[model samples]
Each structure stands twice: as C-alpha cells, then as structure tokens.
Target: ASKRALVILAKGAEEMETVIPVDVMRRAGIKVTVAGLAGKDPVQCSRDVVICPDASLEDAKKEGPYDVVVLPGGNLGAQNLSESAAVKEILKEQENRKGLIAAICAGPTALLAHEIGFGSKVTTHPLAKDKMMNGGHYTYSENRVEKDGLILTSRGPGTSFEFALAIVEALNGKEVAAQVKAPLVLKD
Candidate 1:
C-alpha cells in the first residue's frame, strides 16, 4: 500500500515548510493531502504566499489513519493551529494510533499546545525554543532535525529540506530518500 501523508494548512503558515514536504513526499510517492484548517480556500502564508488546500480539515478527517501527519510553522499559523479543537483531536488520534507526526519551526509549538509528545526530545526554531519549552515537558535540542519514536521535528525554513527529507525517509526508506535528494543539488 502507498504511504499517505496529511499536511494541515492554516492562515499564516510558512509556505516553504508546507510545499517542500508536499513536493518531496510526492517525489517519494506518498499520497499527500493538503488540508485547509478553514474551508477549501486559498490560504495566505506568513510571507504572503498563497496556497490552496485540497480539502477541508473537516473533510480530510474522514480519510484518516494516514502514515504521517504534518504541521508547518509560522508563529501565527501555529497559534491558529494551537487554538483549534480539530487539530487537537487529529494529533491525539495520530498519537493514539502510533503514526508519525512531523512538525517544523514554530509548528512543534502546536504539539506543545495540544499536549502531544511530552517527554520526547524535540527541536524547534531557535526563536521558538522558549515557547516550546515553556512547561519543560520536553527535552529541547539544537539539532536541525530530531526524531523520537513517532515524533519528528526540525528547526526553520532553512532546515525545511532536511525536515522534508526526514519525513520522506521515514515513510519510504533511506534509498528512496537518497534517490529523491540527489537531484535537488543540496549541499548536504
């Protein structure tokens, strides 16, 4: 069966963080769903890049049990996600099912808000560190990418490729990840 991934999109999300994973995961042949937190409409990202989600989160919830659930970060984006009851339920279900959960930059802060993955070693954008570590429920790391069990995380837009490739590697395999990475001409 093909691996499936769900990327939750919200207003003010970081476009680079959202697109890179969707692109790289598709390159890895995963079935990727770009779901909008709001209705099916174009979302305005943090830098003003607009993205159209494939389905509403309400609709996407019916297609459940994906291989991975992805959260992209912008401070406001994360805040939006953090305040969402739908997002809370999704994260809880993913955790309960032992599926992979990947968050980047301020994205992980949403995980914190939902009280998911506590006690795992996670990393977030440096500027977001204090917020993510507010209650000290998680062990913070400075690594560009950090994965503990089903929880995977990365820093910022600069670390997005590594973050996306990490998700690809998890859902696919090292060989597939290598195959997908080579043509991108990445520095490392």
Candidate 2:
C-alpha cells in the first residue's frame, strides 16, 4: 500500500526543515499532505517563507488516520503547535495507535509538551537537548536519525537530508531508501 504522511505546519515553522521532508518524501513517491494548523490559508515560516497548506487542522484531523505525523522545528513554531488543541489531540491519538511520529530540531519539544515521549528515546537539535531531556531518556547522536518505537527524531538543519531519508526507509523499506539516497550522493 502507498504510504500517506501528514505534515502539520504551524505559523513560524522552520522553512528548510519543513520543506526538505516534504520534498524528499514526495520524491520517494509517498503521499504527503502539508496541512496548516492555523487555518486554510498560507502560514509564514520562521524564515519568512509563506507556505500554502493543503488543508486546515480541522480538515486534516478528519481525513487523517495517516501513516505518519511529522513536525518541523523552528523558533516558536514548535511551541505554537504544542499549545494548539488540535495538534495535541492528534499526537495523543497517534501515540495511542502506535503510529509513526517524527520531529526534527525543536519539533521534539512538542512531543515533550504532549507527554508523548515518556520512556521513549529521542533526540533534538543540540541546543535543545537540555529541554528535550526533560521528557524522555535522551540520547545524543551525530547521525541524523534516531528511532525509538514509533517515534523518530533528528538534530537540526544539518540532519534534514538523512532525517527525511530515514522516514523514507521506515515507510518504504531500506532498498527504496538506498536508491533515493544514492542519487543524492548521500553516504551511510
């Protein structure tokens, strides 16, 4: 079956962090929906890039029973998303179902706020480790991907490639991931 992913983009989202995964996943043939948490209109990312969302949070919540839920980290985007009732409820539901949940950079902080990191191993942007540690057993990794159960986390902008590739692997398997990574000149 083709995999479907839901990417929740809030106002002030990290532009690179958000766009990279969506691009990589789409390139790998996964169905990705970039939904806006604020409303149906475009949301301004932390980098000042405005992204038009495929759907609103309310619409996504209803259409979804997605294979994965992704969060991209930025200045206050993670915090804003964490405080959103819709995002919080989605996280809770995904956690209960053991569906894949991924966060990069400050995105993991949302997991912490939602209490979804309990007893899970996670990583975040280096500067935010102290904060991420408060939620779960934190492990530091130079590598881009860290998977613990259904949760996957990565470092910051530097890890975006590997981070997205890892999700491709998780959903599509290692063979397809290798094919996608090779063309990008990415080394294991």
Candidate 3:
C-alpha cells in the first residue's frame, strides 16, 4: 500500500525543505498531507512564501494512522513546534508505532526539545547540531540523509532533494527512489 505522510508547517517553516518533499512524494505516488499547526490559516515559509495547508494539524491528527511524520525546519518554526503539547504528543505516539519520523535542519532540535532523542541517531543543519545533540550521541554525516530505525533526519537546504528521495526510498523501496532521483540528476 502507498504510504500516508504528514508534513507539518508552522508560521516560519523552511521553504525548500517543506515543499520539496511534498513535490517528490506526490510524484512518487505517495499520499502527502501538508498540515498547518495552531490553526487553519496559511503558514509562512522561511523564504517569506506563504502556503495554505491542506488541513489543520488537529484535523490531520484525528485522520491519521500516518506512515510518516515530517518536520521541516526554520528558526522559529522548530521552536514553535517543540513548544506545542499537541505536536509533541503526536511525535511520541508516532514513535511508539515505529513509523517514520523525520526532521530537517533545526527541526531535529525540535525533536530533541521534546526529549525524544534518547536512542535515536539524528542529524541536522551544521549550525544547529550543538542544540540537536541534546545530551544524546549522533553520527555526523556528509550524506544528505541519515536513518536510524524509523526515524530519518537530514541537514539543511542543500540536502532537500536527497532528503526527500531518502524518505521515498524508505516508504516505497530503492527502485522507486531511484526512479524519483533520476530526473534530478543528483550525484550519489
């Protein structure tokens, strides 16, 4: 069965990290839901672009038995998500299900902020690793994607395509991931 993925967007999400995964996943035939936190209003991207959500976080949470939960990063966006009790509850529940839980850039720090980093190997934007480390050990990777169990994390803007392709590969398989990566012409 095709995977159902949730990509959460707050007021200041990273534009590329948020949009690339949605685009690639849809192209690869995965069901992608873009959810807005706090309310139903349009959320602003780090680049100043505004994207109206497909559904509010509350609505999506109720509808989900999602295959994956994605968090795209920006400075305040990560902070906002981390501080939300509802968001943290969703993360905890998803982790318990052994479903894919991914974050990019500062988004990883949000995961850490929720105290979920205990046994996970995660990575984030170079500048934010100190915060993401969060009393837990992590493997540093030059590769755009890093997977530990059902959790997949990536670095910053430069890694968006590779990150999205990694999630596709994890959800579908290597064959579909390769097909999605072909047009991008990205070096392995």
Candidate 4:
C-alpha cells in the first residue's frame, strides 16, 4: 500500500508550510490528506491565502493509521492547533503508534502544548524557540530540519521545501526524495 500522510489545516496556518509539503508529498506519490480542523470549509491562512481542505478532520480521523501527521506553523495557526483537544488526541495516538509527526516553525510548539515527544531534539522558528523551551521538555536545535526518531521538525517558511523533502525522504526513501528534489531545483 502507498504511504499516507495527514496534514492538519487550521485557520491562520502558514500557507507555504502547508502547501509545500502537500504538493511535494504528492509528487513523491504519497497519499496525502489535507484535513480541516474546523470542518470542511475554506480556511483563511496567515498571510491571507485561502485553502479548501480535502476533508474535515473529524471525518478524516475515521480513516486512521496514517504514516505521518503534519502540522504547519504561523502564530495563530499553531495556537489553534495547540488548543485543539482533537489535535492532542491525534498526536498522542500517533506517538503511541510510533508514527511520524512532522511540524515546522511555530508548529512544533503545538507538540509542546500536548506534552508529546519530550527530550527529542526539535527546531522551531526562532521566534517560537523560547516557548518551545519554556519547560525544557525537549532539547532545541538550530538545524534547518531536525528529526529525532518519530518526531520531525523544522524552522520557518524559508525552510518549507527542505522540510517537505525531509518528509518525503522519511516516508519514501533517499532515492525518491532525490528524484523529487531534482525536479524542484533545490539547493543541496
């Protein structure tokens, strides 16, 4: 079966962080679901870009067992994700299953909110570093992309492509990731 990924989309999410991964994963042939946290309606992103999700998260949850769950960042977007009980449950379940959970920029702060992946090395957008480190729950890193076991993280929008390719490399393989990367003309 093809590997699957679930991307949680919320109002105020970072469009670049969201779209880049979704597009890149599709290029890698992963079955990707763009699920809306608040029902299947168009979401207004942080920078005013609007996106229509593939399904409501509530409905998407029924499908179960995705290989990865993705969280995109923006202050308000990550805040919404952090406050969601549904998100908390999903992250917890994914962790319990030892599945991959990928977050970028402020997105990793949501992991902090849910008490997931403690002690893992994580990288979040510089502005969110203090909050991610508030309790010393996880060690911090300055890498553009950081992955510790099941937890994968990255910095801000500038690193979105690298973040997405990292996910592709995780789910697919280095060859597939390189294949996907080559056409993208990414810096090595």
Tell me how far candidate 4 lies from the true structure as C-alpha RMSD in angstroms.
Answer: 0.6
lDDT of 2 by residue, 91-149 (tens): 99999998999999999989878888577778888787888776345555545678989
Error of 2 at 160 (Å): 0.5
The stretch of ten residues in a row with the least summed lDDT in candidate 2 is 134-143
Q: After superposition, how far is residue 40 of candidate 3 from its true place, in Å?
A: 1.7
Q: CA lDDT of 140 in candidate 4?
A: 92
C-alpha root-mean-square deviation, each candidate: 0.6, 1.6, 1.5, 0.6
Q: lDDT of candidate 1?
A: 0.96
TM-score of 2: 0.93
Question: Tens digit of lDDT per residue, candidate 1, span 58-162?
Answer: 999999889999999999999999999999999999999999999999999999999999999999999999999998999999999999999999999999999
Candidate 4 error regions (>4 Å): none
Candidate with the larger lDDT of 2 and 4: 4
Candidate 2: pairs in clash: none
lDDT for 22 in candidate 3 is 95
Q: What's the number of clashes in each of the models?
A: 0, 0, 0, 0
Top-lDDT structure, candidate number: 4
Cα lDDT of model 4 by residue, 1-188, tens digit: 89999999999999999999999999999999999999999999999999999999999999988999999999999999999999999999999999999999999999999999999999999999999999788999999999999999999999999999999998898999999998888778
Better of 2 and 3 by lDDT: 2
Task: Tell me model 3's lDDT, rounded to 2 decimals.
Answer: 0.86
Residue 5 of model 3, lDDT score: 93
Name the lDDT of candidate 2: 0.87
